[PDB]
Amino acid sequence: SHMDALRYHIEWNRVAEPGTARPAGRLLAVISPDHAGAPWVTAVLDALGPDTVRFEAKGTDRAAWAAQLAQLREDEGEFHAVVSLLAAAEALHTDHGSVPLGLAQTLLLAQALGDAGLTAPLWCLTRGGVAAGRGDVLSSPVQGALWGLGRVIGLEHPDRWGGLIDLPETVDTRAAARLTGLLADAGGEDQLAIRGSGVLARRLAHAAPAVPGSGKRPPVHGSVLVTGGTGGIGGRVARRLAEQGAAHLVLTSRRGADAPGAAELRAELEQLGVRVTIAACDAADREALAALLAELPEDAPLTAVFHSAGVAHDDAPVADLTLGQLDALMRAKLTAARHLHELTADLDLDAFVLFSSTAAVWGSGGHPGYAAANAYLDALAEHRRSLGLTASSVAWGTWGEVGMATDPEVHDRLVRQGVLAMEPEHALGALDQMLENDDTAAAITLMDWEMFAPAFTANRPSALLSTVPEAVSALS
C-alpha cells in the first residue's frame, strides 16, 4: 500500500571485522574532566594507549579551546583522528537546563576544531546511546541525542568527520581491538556499534507491510494527552483520535486556548461528541504537567500520550549554533519528554508516542539542534521499551497542508532534496499502521530517492542507505 510505502525502519547489520593494527599516527583523545570516571571511559583511554594526546575540555568556552587545540596541533602536527569521550557528561549544563553538558561540549569541540584548523576526523563515542542487536538495551537516551548532532556534523563538515561508535557495557580486549581497528580504517562506515557478537552498522530499510491486530493496539478510549495539540499535526491527530472514540482529549501548548485556530479546532472535535480540554501548559514545566494530570476524571484516566510539542526555528549551522539556541530547541523535546516519561511511568499507558523527524534519522544540514532534540526522542522510546513500558517514536518527513512546513521557505527546502510533502490522511494512516504493529520506531516519509540519494551522498557515501534499493539504483 501507499501507506506501507511511507514507513521505514532503522536496523543494525553485521559488518566486517576490522584489521588488527592500531592507527599509525597520533590520536587526540578529548575528555570531559568532571565526567571521566565511567568504566567505558577508562577502558577507551586504556585502549588508545599512553602515546595518545589528551585534551581536557573544561567548561564550555569555544575561544579558549580553539587556542588550546591550536597549540596542541602546532606541537604534534597532524593527528590521525580526534576521539571524543565527551558523551559521558550526561549532567545538565548549569546555564542551559535542557542541554546535557556532553552535548554542549561536543558542539563546541566541533566548532573549536574548525577554528583551530585541526583536520583529523572526529569520532564521537557513546555507551548505551543506541539499541543495536538482539535484546540490546539503550541505557542512555541523553547520549542518544548526540547521534542526531553527529549525523549533521557529517553533513556540514564531511571532510573532518569520522563518525559515531557505541561501546558495549564492558570494553574487553576484543571490543578494544574493534575500536582501534575502526579508527585505523572503518570500511566506509560511520554509524557503528561494537557488541559482544561483532561490529554492527546502522541501516535504513523499508518497513514490513501492515498486519492489522498484530501488536494488539487497544481501542482508543479514556483521556488522551496531545502536547502541541493545538498545532498543525497535533490538531489532525486529535481529530483522528476523536473519530476513533477518545472520550476526552487534552490538548496543550504554550498558548493554549489562545493558540491560532483553537476555537475552530475545539468546535470540530466537540461535534464528534468528544470532551475537549485545552490548556496553556509549557511541556517543559513539570509542575504544570503534574497539575494537568491531577485534574483528570476518575472515569477518564490517562490512556495515551502523543507528544507533538516542538519548534524548529532559530537553529543554525554547526559552526554558528549557540548554546542558548540549542537550549531552546531541546526544551520541548528532551525536557518535556523526560517529564512525560517520569510522570506516566506508573500509569500503564496504552501508547506513549513521540513525534521525531527525519532530521534525526539521517540528518539535515542547517538543523543540528533540531536533529539532536529529535534523536533524544527516538532514544527515549527504545529506553522505555527496555523498562517494559510502551513507547514509540515516529520520525516524520515533510507534512503537507498543516504544520511547520507550510512556510514556502522550509517546504521549498525539503521537497527539493526529495523529502516530499505527505497528505495528512496518508501520514496518519501510516501512523495507525505503526501503532497497530506496536512498532517502537519508524520514519514515516514520502521520498523521491532519485533526487535524495545522489544529493545526500555528493560529498561522502552513506552506508545507511545501502539497504534501500531505490537509493542503490539512484546511485548506479
Ligand SMILES: NC(=O)C1=CN([C@@H]2O[C@H](COP(=O)(O)OP(=O)(O)OC[C@H]3O[C@@H](n4cnc5c(N)ncnc54)[C@H](OP(=O)(O)O)[C@@H]3O)[C@@H](O)[C@H]2O)C=CC1
Ligand atoms: N510538520 C512537519 O513536516 C514535521 C513536524 N515534525 C514534528 O511534529 C511536531 C508537530 O509539528 P507541527 O504540527 O508541524 O508544528 P506546529 O508549529 O504546527 O505545532 C507545534 C506545536 O507545539 C507547540 N509547542 C512548541 N513548544 C512548546 C512547548 N515548550 N510546550 C508546549 N507546546 C509547545 C506549539 O504551540 P505553542 O507555540 O503555543 O507552544 C504548537 O502547538 C513537532 O514536534 C515537529 O518537530 C517533525 C517532522 C516534520
